[PDB]
RNA sequence: GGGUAGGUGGUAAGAACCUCAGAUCCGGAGAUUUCCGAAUGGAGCAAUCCGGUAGUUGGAAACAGCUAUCAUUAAUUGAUGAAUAAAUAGUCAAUUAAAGCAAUACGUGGUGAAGUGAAACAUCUCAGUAGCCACAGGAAAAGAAAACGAAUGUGAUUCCGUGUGUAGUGGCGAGCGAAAGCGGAACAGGCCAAACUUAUCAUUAGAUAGGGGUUGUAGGGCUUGCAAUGUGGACUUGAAAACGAUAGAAGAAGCUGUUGGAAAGCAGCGCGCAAAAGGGUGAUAGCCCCGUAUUUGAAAUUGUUUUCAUACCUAGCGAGAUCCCUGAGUAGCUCGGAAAACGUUAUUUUGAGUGAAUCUGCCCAGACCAUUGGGUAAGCCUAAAUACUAAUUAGUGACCGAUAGCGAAACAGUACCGUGAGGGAAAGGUGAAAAGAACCCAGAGAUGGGAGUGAAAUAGAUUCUGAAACCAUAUGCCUACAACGUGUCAGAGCACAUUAAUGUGUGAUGGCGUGCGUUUUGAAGUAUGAGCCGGCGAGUUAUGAUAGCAAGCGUUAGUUAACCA
RNA sequence: UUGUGGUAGACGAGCGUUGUAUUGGAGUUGAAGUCAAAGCGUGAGCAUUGGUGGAUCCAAUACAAGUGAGAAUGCCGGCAUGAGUAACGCUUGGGAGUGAGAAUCUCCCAAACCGAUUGACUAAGGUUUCCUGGACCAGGGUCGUCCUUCCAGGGUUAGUCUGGACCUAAGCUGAGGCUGAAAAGCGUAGGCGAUGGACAACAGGUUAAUAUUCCUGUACUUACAGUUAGACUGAUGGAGUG
RNA sequence: AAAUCCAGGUACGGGUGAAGACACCCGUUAGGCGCAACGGGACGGAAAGACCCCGUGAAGCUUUACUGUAGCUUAAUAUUG
């Protein structure tokens, strides 16, 4: 399975942004990146191009979007625990459904 | 089958979809596989053209779709059948194999030079090398003594060390150079012909298909008995098991503060280890991530080994007879060549000619004869150790790091050159992240100057660092009566202030002064080589000999080579 | 105390580069590289500071070398000198327009050369160079708003034309076969091979680009089937013509 | 653009010198820098002299040079009575 999936809450443990909590919107496995909403906001200088029916307007000024972040800098966020903390996960297989599930190693919380 | 939550190959954003009834992706097994090309229906200027035959569907037929088949050679079988009665030649049909390619590499065989050396050259060497051709194989070749060879000897072949640069062979010149023996790697021996016998061929068999046999301290057959039912194979089918190969699963351990754009660096306090190999993460991370040590797992295909059964092959010691068999245009010999270290010679081989004997036999022990001894030619097959790497997996390097390393880090045998064979380049790096510069000004625009992002824009796509030659700008000094290898020793004036040093920059003027390498008796040279700058560019390696120095071991010393771990 | 010029040459002692092995050390508070300066050594050489640069490097003792560049009419790359010099490879003037910019682009009027040709149709070859619009990185021996250059789109219509589905010449290939160490050479029957032979379409119009091809008009030729009438049909071979 | 180019700030007379000097010795002359000319010199440039000699160099050709050989011719022997 994968350490980080599309949807789970995640934070950053290195860089200028420390303790930045967000939801992963998209994962590129090949480039080992991850788009997390609200984090790594870059503002491309949006030019103007008019060669299509939609390009006739293409209103784009200082649109701030999301820049991808290396998957190593991401860490899963705990929610079930009363005191939330950042830890590592296991890949135990519970015989109830025989499906692999991530479980933290500093607690006993699933996913 | 594995495996998930993403995917629709790269320059690549966007549009539109697919995907949790399990996608994309990885592995095993299959399906489809246009045309040229051995190309093989016929042709042809390769990727084109023109068909025949037998089916089937439309048409009223020509015709048009959709299928299968149609080359040549060799072998077997059957049919037909000339000159010419029979019979062959030939013709036709059916079945089975062959064609070709590549691994710039190893094997075998045929053919086979020259440059060069001998300080010339012809014998010789180079060299049975290059090249040309044929046939393979996963290796090939060789192979079980008519042997070595001098002994109370060894007992297929192959490969390594030594014997040794020895015996020898050489216009006895340049050179060439074994075979024994010894030490090792591996080890395996089998099977036909003839006798004798069985059955069948107008049985003129002298032919076909079986039993019997495979030799040297001779063997086998003929007749007559004892003992045997085993051990082992280079061996067929199956069944079972084990070890693997082709995807994978799990896989421990960290926070705080400081400089910093960013920590993983630094410091403090800790933790894990059968994991401190490696890669990435904004700098230099055992504990951030992927992994690694370790434990594991295969539906399907495939490799090795073992066990059981099952085919095939595989078996000893006597007696008598005194009879038969033991590989012929063969061994020898003569005339021309060659192979072996030998430049032809005892041994091996052959183009021409001739030509034997049959265990009281034949060959050999460097001409040859006799004695002694060794071995059984003229038939075949043979694993292992040995040679090599185009390719697949893992990994290593006192190997290279864009003039280096493969010619080719990029889309390189490309661009390009030549009718053709053939020849054959250069060219890598923005930033952590494109956040690739919206917007304003000048301009026609590219572009430039600001703004903005960024730690850095003198990192801006001309994109890591940016040297010299070369071209321009400027502070300071000098220079327009001056004979100059352009410098050196003195020396005013001018302008500054340093790796603080009897300082630095320029140099009115005085004295002296014909470059650097090469090759020459002798070069400023009217001898030669260099336009300048930068990179590259020429005493090495392997095997031996001598001598100097030093160390280890020493007076029945010293030291191993191959090979094994 | 005696000495210390020196080529060929002999001997001895050292420096420097890259990497490896052992020790220690420095580095985003800035390493290598790289530039400058008024330093230290007997020599190869070695430091200090500052600028640029952005991640490795240094000292000691040993070891191994693709280990030292000024010359080879040396190789490669760059840049000078000659020198803004020679040369720019046969053809004039003006008006109007476009354009930011015009001797060079567009149109018009002349002018000058070709006129058995610089005119028109095609074979061979070339392979999109053809037409339209746009552009002025590069190429055009100047310029350029323009080009045979570049970008985007488009363009080649056959029963009768040129060649196959027809035929052969020189010649090539060639089952069998002959010859030859091998590869192969020769060659019969067959099969290819035009630059030749046989074969049915002419006139006009149309698009920016095609036209005996598309359109209009009028024709012709060869096959197959049905049908009507007549006739016995007569080749893979012989002969004539070709 | 081009060949060329050791660096140049590149006079003349007599002498000297590797024997014919822009550069040496002794004298004379000459303000700095161009442009258009013409070729005296720079033993000017282009071509590692083709003439000559040397090399125990190469190649082509010749012959009663040497050694061989294709081919031609003669004999023995086998096919061969
Ligand atoms: Mg599946
Ligand atoms: Mg010779
Ligand atoms: Mg010689
Ligand atoms: Mg010689
Ligand atoms: Mg064999
Ligand atoms: Mg895993
Ligand atoms: Mg882990
Ligand atoms: Mg690390
Ligand atoms: Mg003999
Ligand atoms: Mg020999
Ligand atoms: Mg005997
Ligand atoms: Mg003897
Ligand atoms: Mg015998
Ligand atoms: Mg290269
Ligand atoms: Mg380069
Ligand atoms: Mg070409
Ligand atoms: Mg800028
Ligand atoms: Mg540049
Ligand atoms: Mg740069
Ligand atoms: Mg003056
Ligand atoms: Mg005067
Ligand atoms: Mg004077
Ligand atoms: Mg003077
Ligand atoms: Mg002076
Ligand atoms: Mg002087
Ligand atoms: Mg020198
Ligand atoms: Mg001389
Ligand atoms: Mg002389
Ligand atoms: Mg001179
Ligand atoms: Mg001369
Ligand atoms: Mg010379
Ligand atoms: Mg010169
Ligand atoms: Mg140089
Ligand atoms: Mg010694
Ligand atoms: Mg001396
Ligand atoms: Mg070192
Ligand atoms: Mg520095
Ligand atoms: Mg070198
Ligand atoms: Mg030049
Ligand atoms: Mg110039
Ligand atoms: Mg001039
Ligand atoms: Mg002139
Ligand atoms: Mg002129
Ligand atoms: Mg002209
Ligand atoms: Mg003119
Ligand atoms: Mg006229
Ligand atoms: Mg014309
Ligand atoms: Mg073109
Ligand atoms: Mg046009
Ligand atoms: Mg145009
Ligand atoms: Mg121009
Ligand atoms: Mg028509
Ligand atoms: Mg034809
Ligand atoms: Mg014709
Ligand atoms: Mg036309
Ligand atoms: Mg004199
Ligand atoms: Mg000469
Ligand atoms: Mg000679
Ligand atoms: Mg010679
Ligand atoms: Mg004769």
From Swiss-Prot:
GO terms for biological process: translation. Signal peptide: none annotated. Part of the 50S ribosomal subunit. The gene is rplX. Keywords: Ribonucleoprotein, Ribosomal protein, RNA-binding, rRNA-binding. The keyword rRNA-binding applies. Residues 43-62 are annotated as: Disordered. GO terms for cellular component: ribonucleoprotein complex; ribosome. InterPro entries: KOW, Rib_uL2_dom2, Ribosomal_uL24, Ribosomal_uL24_CS, Ribosomal_uL24_KOW, Translation_prot_SH3-like_sf. This is Large ribosomal subunit protein uL24. It comes from Mycoplasma pneumoniae (strain ATCC 29342 / M129 / Subtype 1). One of two assembly initiator proteins, it binds directly to the 5'-end of the 23S rRNA, where it nucleates assembly of the 50S subunit.
């Amino acid at each position: 399975m994968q350490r980080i999936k599309k949807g789970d809450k995640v934070v950053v443990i290195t860089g200028k942004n420390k303790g930045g909590s967000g939801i992963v919107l998209k994962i590129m496995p090949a480039r080992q990146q991850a788009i997390v909403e609200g984090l790594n906001k870059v503002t491309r200088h949006k030019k103007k191009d008019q060669t299509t029916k939609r390009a006739a307007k293409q209103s784009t000024g200082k649109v701030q979007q999301e820049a991808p972040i290396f998957l190593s800098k991401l860490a899963l966020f705990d929610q079930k625990a009363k005191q939330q903390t950042i830890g590592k996960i296991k890949y135990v297989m519970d015989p109830k459904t025989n499906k692999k599930t991530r479980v933290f190693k500093k607690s006993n919380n699933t996913l």
